[PDB]
Design an enzyme around this catalytic site. Structure first.
Site, PDB file in Angstrom:
ATOM      1  N   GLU A 198       0.797  -1.123   0.131  1.00 10.74           N
ATOM      2  CA  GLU A 198      -0.055   0.012   0.044  1.00 10.74           C
ATOM      3  C   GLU A 198       0.899   1.226   0.146  1.00 10.74           C
ATOM      4  O   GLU A 198       0.279   2.396  -0.012  1.00 10.74           O
ATOM      5  CB  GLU A 198      -1.081   0.110   1.273  1.00 10.74           C
ATOM      6  CG  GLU A 198      -2.046  -1.162   1.098  1.00 10.74           C
ATOM      7  CD  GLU A 198      -3.049  -0.963   2.103  1.00 10.74           C
ATOM      8  OE1 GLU A 198      -2.970  -1.180   3.225  1.00 10.74           O
ATOM      9  OE2 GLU A 198      -4.141  -0.739   1.755  1.00 10.74           O
ATOM     10  N   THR A 219       0.754   1.963  -8.226  1.00  9.97           N
ATOM     11  CA  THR A 219       0.376   3.190  -8.864  1.00  9.97           C
ATOM     12  C   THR A 219       1.373   3.831  -9.482  1.00  9.97           C
ATOM     13  O   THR A 219       1.281   4.386 -10.748  1.00  9.97           O
ATOM     14  CB  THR A 219       0.146   4.119  -7.601  1.00  9.97           C
ATOM     15  OG1 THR A 219      -1.318   3.562  -6.826  1.00  9.97           O
ATOM     16  CG2 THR A 219      -0.532   5.382  -8.114  1.00  9.97           C
ATOM     17  N   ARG A 228      -7.420   0.573  -5.664  1.00 12.91           N
ATOM     18  CA  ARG A 228      -6.730  -0.428  -4.917  1.00 12.91           C
ATOM     19  C   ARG A 228      -6.922  -1.880  -5.233  1.00 12.91           C
ATOM     20  O   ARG A 228      -8.130  -2.543  -5.055  1.00 12.91           O
ATOM     21  CB  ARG A 228      -6.997  -0.139  -3.406  1.00 12.91           C
ATOM     22  CG  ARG A 228      -6.446  -1.162  -2.504  1.00 12.91           C
ATOM     23  CD  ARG A 228      -5.003  -1.594  -2.808  1.00 12.91           C
ATOM     24  NE  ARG A 228      -4.366  -2.547  -2.044  1.00 12.91           N
ATOM     25  CZ  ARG A 228      -3.113  -2.986  -2.136  1.00 12.91           C
ATOM     26  NH1 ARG A 228      -2.520  -2.154  -2.656  1.00 12.91           N
ATOM     27  NH2 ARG A 228      -2.700  -3.901  -1.142  1.00 12.91           N
ATOM     28  N   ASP A 258       8.139  -4.444 -10.072  1.00 15.96           N
ATOM     29  CA  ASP A 258       7.303  -4.192  -8.906  1.00 15.96           C
ATOM     30  C   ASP A 258       7.425  -5.528  -8.028  1.00 15.96           C
ATOM     31  O   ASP A 258       6.651  -6.303  -8.106  1.00 15.96           O
ATOM     32  CB  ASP A 258       5.899  -3.706  -9.119  1.00 15.96           C
ATOM     33  CG  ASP A 258       5.174  -3.232  -7.995  1.00 15.96           C
ATOM     34  OD1 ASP A 258       5.589  -3.783  -6.703  1.00 15.96           O
ATOM     35  OD2 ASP A 258       3.636  -3.209  -8.140  1.00 15.96           O
ATOM     36  N   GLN A 318       5.751 -11.292  -1.169  1.00 12.77           N
ATOM     37  CA  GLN A 318       5.535 -12.745  -1.127  1.00 12.77           C
ATOM     38  C   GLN A 318       7.012 -13.546  -0.912  1.00 12.77           C
ATOM     39  O   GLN A 318       7.999 -12.819  -1.006  1.00 12.77           O
ATOM     40  CB  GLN A 318       5.052 -13.072  -2.542  1.00 12.77           C
ATOM     41  CG  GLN A 318       5.837 -12.357  -3.641  1.00 12.77           C
ATOM     42  CD  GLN A 318       5.394 -12.974  -5.027  1.00 12.77           C
ATOM     43  OE1 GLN A 318       4.251 -13.417  -5.336  1.00 12.77           O
ATOM     44  NE2 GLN A 318       6.289 -12.931  -6.191  1.00 12.77           N
TER      45      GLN A 318
HETATM   46  N1  LIG Z   1      -3.828  10.230  -2.017  1.00 16.86           N
HETATM   47  C1  LIG Z   1      -2.895   9.437  -2.535  1.00 16.86           C
HETATM   48  N2  LIG Z   1      -3.172   8.083  -2.530  1.00 16.86           N
HETATM   49  C2  LIG Z   1      -2.137   7.448  -2.920  1.00 16.86           C
HETATM   50  C3  LIG Z   1      -0.740   7.751  -3.374  1.00 16.86           C
HETATM   51  N3  LIG Z   1       0.110   6.631  -3.807  1.00 16.86           N
HETATM   52  C4  LIG Z   1      -1.006   5.679  -3.638  1.00 16.86           C
HETATM   53  N4  LIG Z   1      -2.089   5.945  -3.304  1.00 16.86           N
HETATM   54  C5  LIG Z   1      -3.409   5.044  -3.415  1.00 16.86           C
HETATM   55  O1  LIG Z   1      -3.116   4.368  -1.981  1.00 16.86           O
HETATM   56  C6  LIG Z   1      -3.106   2.695  -2.456  1.00 16.86           C
HETATM   57  C7  LIG Z   1      -1.435   2.138  -2.886  1.00 16.86           C
HETATM   58  O2  LIG Z   1      -1.690   1.267  -3.752  1.00 16.86           O
HETATM   59  P1  LIG Z   1      -0.796   0.777  -4.860  1.00 16.86           P
HETATM   60  O3  LIG Z   1      -0.137   1.960  -5.524  1.00 16.86           O
HETATM   61  O4  LIG Z   1      -2.290   0.114  -5.482  1.00 16.86           O
HETATM   62  O5  LIG Z   1      -0.577  -0.697  -3.842  1.00 16.86           O
HETATM   63  P2  LIG Z   1       0.977  -0.865  -3.426  1.00 16.86           P
HETATM   64  O6  LIG Z   1       1.821  -1.210  -4.524  1.00 16.86           O
HETATM   65  O7  LIG Z   1       0.948  -1.830  -2.489  1.00 16.86           O
HETATM   66  O8  LIG Z   1       1.734   0.122  -2.309  1.00 16.86           O
HETATM   67  C8  LIG Z   1      -3.871   2.826  -3.936  1.00 16.86           C
HETATM   68  O9  LIG Z   1      -5.130   2.878  -3.270  1.00 16.86           O
HETATM   69  C9  LIG Z   1      -3.529   4.349  -4.336  1.00 16.86           C
HETATM   70  O10 LIG Z   1      -4.396   4.666  -5.359  1.00 16.86           O
HETATM   71  C10 LIG Z   1      -0.391   9.249  -2.917  1.00 16.86           C
HETATM   72  O11 LIG Z   1       0.690   9.701  -3.202  1.00 16.86           O
HETATM   73  N5  LIG Z   1      -1.430   9.883  -2.674  1.00 16.86           N
END
Ligand SMILES: Nc1nc2c(ncn2[C@@H]2O[C@H](COP(=O)(O)OP(=O)(O)O)[C@@H](O)[C@H]2O)c(=O)[nH]1
Lengths: 299, 12
Positions: A10, A15, A138, A160, A164
């Protein structure tokens, strides 16, 4: 260029991958976005549900007793107009908002407010997810993900890596020939009820000081600065770092967190950390920052 | 026989 994307779940890894596709790969067509509609609905639904369930545990009453029936209907109904109506009214209730404002006490998707505040648009029969909607979604990424793209005459192989388990052999092929590592941190995790921020520091520690990355560019992505700036206004950094004596402005608190991570580097004189404050969902910011990261790789 | 990447690096 072999790029490794690391960081706790998360923190924003997937993203950023999406941003690379948007910035250097042709982005998300309208039909590609249509595929995320289900996820957007699912994220919206689980968010409002998480808030209501929390109300029970935390013993928070609705602002209007009428909502009780909507809450009941919510669970039964789970995007029909019927369900949308139940969600809009629950999201509007002061009691529900009271619980939402206390999200640091339970598990709630970062994008919860983003979707709930935009329900009208999302609920429309012919709703078509926008890029920002997709970026906001997400979905847990299980297993290593890879993306390719050319930028400034360089061919990037971005991996990425999640959390795991795997054979030492696979990790070896993973960590070898790594030109640069980007470690993602969720700044907004600082006050979440060991500390989530400290878990993250522990992770960064092992990356930063490992002998086999002596010639690998270590890049620190202090992410979710946008959520962080909002939270810092009401939730003090002391919750995360009890010894912190500075002010609760976005600037001081952010500088402090950055300092805590950079201090982990046991070879300040030999190894340099490349820190950036990012908003992974802001493609304009990710583009600027990635451009900067690319230059450091050229140099 | 399988491990996270963190424990993999934390190996002595
Ligand atoms: N507001 C906001 N949301 C973010 C940011 N970076 C990631 N997210 C959100 O927080 C979550 C992290 O998700 P992702 O990037 O899906 O997963 P990760 O790779 O496990 O960390 C997703 O719901 C994104 O849309 C950021 O800088 N700002």
């Amino acid at each position: 260029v072999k790029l490794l994307l690391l960081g706790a779940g998360e923190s924003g890894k997937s993203t950023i991958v999406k941003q690379m596709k948007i910035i250097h790969e042709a982005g998300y067509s309208e039909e590609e976005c249509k595929q995320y509609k289900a996820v957007v609905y699912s994220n919206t639904i689980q968010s409002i549900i998480a808030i209501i369930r929390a109300m029970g545990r935390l013993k928070i009453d609705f602002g209007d007793s009428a909502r009780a029936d909507d809450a009941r209907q919510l669970f039964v109904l789970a995007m029909t107009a019927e369900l949308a109506g139940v969600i809009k009214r629950l999201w509007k209730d002061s009691g529900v908002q009271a619980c939402f404002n206390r999200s640091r006490e339970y598990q709630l998707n970062d994008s919860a407010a983003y979707y709930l505040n935009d329900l009208d648009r999302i609920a429309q029969p012919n709703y078509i997810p926008t890029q920002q909607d997709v970026l906001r979604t997400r979905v847990k990424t299980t297993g290593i993900v890879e993306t390719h793209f050319t930028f400034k005459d360089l061919h990037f192989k971005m991996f990425d890596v999640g959390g795991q388990r795997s054979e030492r052999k696979k990790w070896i092929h993973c960590f070898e020939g790594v030109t640069a590592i980007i470690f993602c941190v969720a700044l907004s995790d600082y006050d979440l009820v060991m500390n989530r921020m400290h878990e993250s520091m522990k992770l960064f520690d092992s990356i930063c000081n490992n002998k086999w990355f002596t010639d690998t560019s270590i890049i620190l992505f202090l992410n979710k600065k946008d959520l962080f700036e909002e939270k810092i206004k009401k939730s003090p950094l002391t919750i995360c770092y009890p010894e912190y004596a500075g002010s609760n402005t976005y600037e001081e608190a952010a500088a402090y967190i950055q300092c805590q991570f950079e201090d982990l580097n046991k070879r300040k004189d030999t190894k340099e950390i490349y820190t950036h404050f990012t908003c992974a969902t802001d493609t304009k910011n990710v583009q600027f920052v990635f451009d900067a990261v690319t230059d450091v790789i050229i140099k | 026989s399988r491990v996270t990447w963190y424990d993999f690096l934390m190996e002595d």
